Design a protein around this nucleic acid. Structure first.
Lengths: 71, 49
DNA sequence: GTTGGATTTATATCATTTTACTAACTGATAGCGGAACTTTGGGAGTAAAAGAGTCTCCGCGAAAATGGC
DNA sequence: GCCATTTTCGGCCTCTGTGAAAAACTCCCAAAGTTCCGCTATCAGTTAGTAAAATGATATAAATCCAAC
C-alpha cells in the first residue's frame, strides 16, 4: 500500500495542493511526518489534517510509523 | 442514464426537476464521472467488463 | 509570600483558496424532412388450334372395434 | 349372432446432419427505396467570470504562573 500515488487517496484538492507544497510524491512519504510537522504548513490547517488522518485511518496507517531500508 | 426509472432524460429535464441549468448539470455529471474514475471505487466495476 | 510580565490559551475578525452557478465559443454528430431519381412490384394482355391424372408401389401380423346382413 | 374391412400397436440409451426435374414475354404505371442536402437538436470540450462558502491565518483579549526580590 505504501507504494501508491497520493492521488489514489481521495482527498480534497486543498490537501493535495498542500502536499505538493512539501513535494510529497507517494504515500508512505506522508506517514513518516508527524502531525506537528505537517501542520506547520501554509494552508494545511485543522480540518484538512482531520480529513487526511481519517482517510489514513481508513487505510489504517495513521501518521508516524517507521519502517526499514526505504527504499 | 435512466436507472430505476421508467424513462431516460436529457439535461433539460434534469435541470427543470431541480433549480439548475444546462452547464451546471453537465459539470455535476463530469464531476461524478471523475469521482467514479478514481481507482478506489472502481475495482468492483472493472470485473464487469 | 508575592506579583507582574510573559508566555501561553480564548475568541473574533480578516484574507486566501475553493466551490457553486453563469455564459460564450468550438466542433461535431445525429436525426428528420423534402426533392429527385432509380429500382421494384402489381396488373393487363397475347386471336392457326391447341379441347379426360396420377403412380410408383404392391416383401406386416395379431387383435379389437366397427358396420352390414 | 356372424362376416369383413378398418384401426391400432409394435423396448431403452448413444451418434446423426439437407442440398440433387419441371419451359414465356411485353408494356404501362405507381410506390417504395436510395441518396443528397439543409435545418435543427443534442452533447462533449474548453475557457473565463462572479458571488459565496470554507478554511486558515492573524489579531486581540485574558489566565495564570513562575522567577526574582
Amino acid at each position: 500500500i505504501l507504494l501508491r500515488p497520493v492521488d489514489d487517496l481521495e482527498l480534497t484538492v486543498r490537501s493535495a495542493n498542500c502536499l505538493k507544497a512539501e513535494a510529497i510524491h507517494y504515500i508512505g512519504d506522508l506517514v513518516q511526518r508527524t502531525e506537528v510537522e505537517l501542520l506547520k504548513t501554509p494552508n494545511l490547517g485543522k480540518k484538512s489534517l482531520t480529513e487526511i488522518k481519517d482517510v489514513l485511518a481508513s487505510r489504517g496507517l495513521s501518521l508516524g510509523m517507521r519502517l526499514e531500508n526505504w527504499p | 442514464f435512466g436507472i430505476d426509472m421508467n424513462t431516460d432524460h436529457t439535461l433539460e429535464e434534469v435541470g427543470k426537476q431541480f433549480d439548475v441549468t444546462r452547464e451546471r448539470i453537465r459539470q455535476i455529471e463530469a464531476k461524478a464521472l471523475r469521482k467514479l474514475r478514481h481507482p478506489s471505487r472502481s475495482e468492483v466495476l472493472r470485473s464487469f467488463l
